Design an enzyme around this catalytic site. Structure first.
Site, PDB file in Angstrom:
ATOM      1  N   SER A  45       0.777  -1.244   0.000  1.00 22.33           N
ATOM      2  CA  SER A  45       0.000   0.000   0.000  1.00 22.33           C
ATOM      3  C   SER A  45       0.811   1.298   0.000  1.00 22.33           C
ATOM      4  O   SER A  45       0.189   2.364  -0.149  1.00 22.33           O
ATOM      5  CB  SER A  45      -0.982  -0.031   1.221  1.00 22.33           C
ATOM      6  OG  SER A  45      -1.974  -1.027   0.956  1.00 22.33           O
ATOM      7  N   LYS A  48      -0.115   3.931  -2.860  1.00 23.05           N
ATOM      8  CA  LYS A  48      -1.332   4.775  -2.870  1.00 23.05           C
ATOM      9  C   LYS A  48      -1.075   6.286  -2.767  1.00 23.05           C
ATOM     10  O   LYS A  48      -1.867   7.102  -3.289  1.00 23.05           O
ATOM     11  CB  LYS A  48      -2.279   4.285  -1.739  1.00 23.05           C
ATOM     12  CG  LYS A  48      -2.901   2.905  -2.106  1.00 23.05           C
ATOM     13  CD  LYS A  48      -3.642   2.208  -0.976  1.00 23.05           C
ATOM     14  CE  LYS A  48      -3.987   0.766  -1.433  1.00 23.05           C
ATOM     15  NZ  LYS A  48      -4.398  -0.101  -0.336  1.00 23.05           N
ATOM     16  N   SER A 105      -6.173   2.856   4.073  1.00 21.54           N
ATOM     17  CA  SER A 105      -5.626   1.787   3.223  1.00 21.54           C
ATOM     18  C   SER A 105      -6.697   0.971   2.478  1.00 21.54           C
ATOM     19  O   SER A 105      -6.524  -0.221   2.162  1.00 21.54           O
ATOM     20  CB  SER A 105      -4.784   0.819   4.072  1.00 21.54           C
ATOM     21  OG  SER A 105      -3.459   0.745   3.636  1.00 21.54           O
ATOM     22  N   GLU A 141      -5.217  -4.440  -7.036  1.00 25.23           N
ATOM     23  CA  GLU A 141      -5.438  -5.074  -5.715  1.00 25.23           C
ATOM     24  C   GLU A 141      -6.355  -6.300  -5.793  1.00 25.23           C
ATOM     25  O   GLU A 141      -7.370  -6.246  -6.501  1.00 25.23           O
ATOM     26  CB  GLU A 141      -6.104  -4.082  -4.754  1.00 25.23           C
ATOM     27  CG  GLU A 141      -5.195  -2.947  -4.255  1.00 25.23           C
ATOM     28  CD  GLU A 141      -4.159  -3.294  -3.185  1.00 25.23           C
ATOM     29  OE1 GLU A 141      -4.045  -4.460  -2.773  1.00 25.23           O
ATOM     30  OE2 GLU A 141      -3.479  -2.383  -2.714  1.00 25.23           O
ATOM     31  N   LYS A 209       2.605   6.764   5.516  1.00 25.75           N
ATOM     32  CA  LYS A 209       1.751   5.744   4.867  1.00 25.75           C
ATOM     33  C   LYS A 209       2.409   4.373   5.050  1.00 25.75           C
ATOM     34  O   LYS A 209       3.577   4.148   4.650  1.00 25.75           O
ATOM     35  CB  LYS A 209       1.587   5.994   3.319  1.00 25.75           C
ATOM     36  CG  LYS A 209       0.764   4.990   2.473  1.00 25.75           C
ATOM     37  CD  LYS A 209      -0.721   5.174   2.835  1.00 25.75           C
ATOM     38  CE  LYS A 209      -1.606   3.967   2.465  1.00 25.75           C
ATOM     39  NZ  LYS A 209      -1.549   2.922   3.481  1.00 25.75           N
ATOM     40  N   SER A 210       1.708   3.399   5.644  1.00 29.53           N
ATOM     41  CA  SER A 210       2.218   2.028   5.778  1.00 29.53           C
ATOM     42  C   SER A 210       1.757   1.010   4.715  1.00 29.53           C
ATOM     43  O   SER A 210       0.995   1.325   3.782  1.00 29.53           O
ATOM     44  CB  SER A 210       1.818   1.539   7.159  1.00 29.53           C
ATOM     45  OG  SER A 210       0.422   1.687   7.338  1.00 29.53           O
ATOM     46  N   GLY A 211       2.283  -0.217   4.804  1.00 31.97           N
ATOM     47  CA  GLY A 211       1.890  -1.298   3.916  1.00 31.97           C
ATOM     48  C   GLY A 211       2.222  -2.661   4.525  1.00 31.97           C
ATOM     49  O   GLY A 211       3.210  -2.783   5.283  1.00 31.97           O
ATOM     50  N   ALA A 212       1.453  -3.697   4.191  1.00 33.59           N
ATOM     51  CA  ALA A 212       1.764  -5.079   4.554  1.00 33.59           C
ATOM     52  C   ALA A 212       1.431  -6.023   3.403  1.00 33.59           C
ATOM     53  O   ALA A 212       0.589  -5.686   2.537  1.00 33.59           O
ATOM     54  CB  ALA A 212       0.951  -5.538   5.749  1.00 33.59           C
TER      55      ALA A 212
END
EC number: 3.5.2.6
Length: 263
Positions: A45, A48, A105, A141, A209-212
């Site tokens: 993510s 984005k 997210s 996605e 901004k994070s992501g996994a």
């Protein structure tokens, strides 16, 4: 500071996997510290932010409007869609979909905005044109989070993502009103509490901004600084670990604590 690199090596030992790290000066663009800066990692993510950067450029050029409403149906919903699944009856505006994609997210919001700009190929073309010949988006996605060993699809490098975020936030590419709108969405992030924000002192500024993803992937991009203003960019990515989500969150927060202690 070299003591932050002692902690990054120790996180690789603890997680049994690769960690990529860079610290960049926002005003001058100078690289202050790095570890694996030119190896590829999955973006997850964190893409984005780049997607809403391209949407805002179309708005500046008169080709799109913040207030335009987009209608969609149950057939469009994919996994982890907390905001879009509550508005099937009346739809959402372009402004509301970029707010959902960055602060929560939301996965369906990102697929709907990808369709309005012409898909993965057109975001990669937008990146190439502003000088980034490394970062690439290839899939939609949720498939872009696969993280297959050695695959180059849907990846960036720490130094590429850091210099592209500096351009988007301080350069002449977007108007001042649009740069501030992107900064406001990142400052309002609601889902990155256990990562860099858990180490931040009182009075400091952060926009992030994070992501996994699969195979232990986890990451964060951020602009942060003292006395309520941003002055450095930090990018951290990891992939391949067999450890739990809580163990991955804790090692990123402890790299954050070192960085702040030695500022």
């Amino acid at each position: 500071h070299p003591e932050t690199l002692v902690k990054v090596k120790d996180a690789e030992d603890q997680l049994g996997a690769r960690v990529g790290y860079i610290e960049l000066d926002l005003n001058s663009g100078k690289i202050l510290e790095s570890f694996r800066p030119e190896e590829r990692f999955p973006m997850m993510s964190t893409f984005k932010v780049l997607l809403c950067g391209a949407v805002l450029s179309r708005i500046d050029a008169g080709q799109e409007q913040l207030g335009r409403r987009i209608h969609y149906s149950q057939n469009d919903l994919v996994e982890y869609s907390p905001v879009t699944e509550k508005h099937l009856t009346d739809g959402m505006t372009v402004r509301e979909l970029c707010s959902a994609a960055i602060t929560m997210s939301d996965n369906t919001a990102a697929n709907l905005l990808l369709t309005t700009i012409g898909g993965p190929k057109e975001l990669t073309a937008f990146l190439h044109n502003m000088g980034d010949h490394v970062t690439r988006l290839d899939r939609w996605e949720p498939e872009l989070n696969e993280a297959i060993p050695n695959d180059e699809r849907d990846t960036t490098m720490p130094v590429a993502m850091a210099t592209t975020l500096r351009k988007l936030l301080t350069g002449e590419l977007l108007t001042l009103a649009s740069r501030q709108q992107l900064i406001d969405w990142m400052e309002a992030d609601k889902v990155a509490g256990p990562l860099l924000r858990s180490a931040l002192p009182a009075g400091w500024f952060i926009a992030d901004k994070s992501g996994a993803g699969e195979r232990g992937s986890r990451g964060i991009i951020a602009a942060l600084g003292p006395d309520g203003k941003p002055s450095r960019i930090v990018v951290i990515y990891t992939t391949g670990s067999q450890a739990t989500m809580d163990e991955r969150n804790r090692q990123i927060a402890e790299i954050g604590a070192s960085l702040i202690k030695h500022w």
